[PDB]
Amino acid sequence: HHWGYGKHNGPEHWHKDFPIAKGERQSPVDIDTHTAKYDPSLKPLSVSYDQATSLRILNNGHAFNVEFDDSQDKAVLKGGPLDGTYRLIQFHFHWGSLDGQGSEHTVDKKKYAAELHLVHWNTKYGDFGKAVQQPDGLAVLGIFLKVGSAKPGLQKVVDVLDSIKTKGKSADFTNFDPRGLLPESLDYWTYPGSLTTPPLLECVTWIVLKEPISVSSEQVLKFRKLNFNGEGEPEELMVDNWRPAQPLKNRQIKASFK
Numbered sequence: 125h126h127w128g129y130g131k132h133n134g135p136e137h138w139h140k141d142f143p144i145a146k147g148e149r150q151s152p153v154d155i156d157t158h159t160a161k162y163d164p165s166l167k168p169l170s171v172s173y174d175q176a177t178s179l180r181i182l183n184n185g186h187a188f189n190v191e192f193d194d195s196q197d198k199a200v201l202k203g204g205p206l207d208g209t210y211r212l213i214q215f216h217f218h219w220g221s222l223d224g225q226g227s228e229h230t231v232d233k234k235k236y237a238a239e240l241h242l243v244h245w246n247t248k249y250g251d252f253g254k255a256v257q258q259p260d261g262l263a264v265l266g267i268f269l270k271v272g273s274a275k276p277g278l279q280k281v282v283d284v285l286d287s288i289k290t291k292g293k294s295a296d297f298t299n300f301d302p303r304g305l306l307p308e309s310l311d312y313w314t315y316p317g318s319l320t321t322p323p324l325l326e327c328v329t330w331i332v333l334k335e336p337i338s339v340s341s342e343q344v345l346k347f348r349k350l351n352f353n354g355e356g357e358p359e360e361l362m363v364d365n366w367r368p369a370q371p372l373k374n375r376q377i378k379a380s381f382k
């Protein structure tokens with residue numbers, strides 16, 4: 125599979141190799157804030173990242189992933205719309221070539237400069253590969269980035285990017301605290317969806333936070349210096365690695381807040 129984000133292999137082409145691209149619960153979606161319904165049944169959201177153990181950071185040719193030790197319940201997400209325990213496995217971002225685009229989800233058609241995905245899998249399925257074959261296999265916590273003040277908690281990520289410029293490069297990335305990437309408020313929207321890249325599997329409970337985090341222009345500029353290509357190949361800047369909004373179809377977006 126040679127999927128990417130260019131004119132010739134971008135989101136409009138994915139359906140040929142991955143027919144679920146036109147499925148009934150694809151992501152991302154536009155969140156229409158006037159249609160989303162407060163749901164008093166949602167339990168409180170619990171982000172328990174105090175024992176998180178980061179390991180490594182990898183440029184996989186699509187984004188960069190900060191990987192965690194998920195061999196035990198070290199960093200988990202529970203509550204909200206979720207039944208049981210979801211274990212943090214990795215986070216990554218999607219971002220733009222310009223500050224006015226980059227997010228996958230949109231809010232009343234507003235695009236943010238980037239979107240963070242903290243990826244968790246349902247521990248009742250034993251491993252990540254089994255979990256992605258289930259409709260409730262993953263919980264992705266989505267956080268919007270806007271350009272303004274610097275995010276101090278992001279800077280350790282920004283500073284390692286020089287060492288993973290090209291596809292296939294990795295670096296040791298221990299003792300990184302993902303709590304420094306969260307906004308103050310955990311108010312969220314939730315809906316059932318999919319992975320936003322191939323294989324586009326319909327396995328995700330989305331939890332999208334209302335409150336964006338602010339990052340600096342200098343921080344997001346450093347994201348844009350990464351490369352989609354491997355070392356010694358023609359340079360293609362890693363920008364606009366986002367899928368646009370997909371049809372909502374027969375789904376409801378629920379709000380955790382009034």
Ligand SMILES: COc1ccc([C@H]2OC(=S)NC2=O)c(OC)c1
Pocket residue numbers: 187216241243264318319320321322323
């Ligand atoms: C093999 O594991 C994967 C594969 C794809 C995705 C994509 O789906 C979202 S969401 N962002 C992505 O990059 C993933 O993230 C949960 C994990």
Ligand SMILES: [Zn+2]
Pocket residue numbers: 216217218241320
């Ligand atoms: Zn993602």
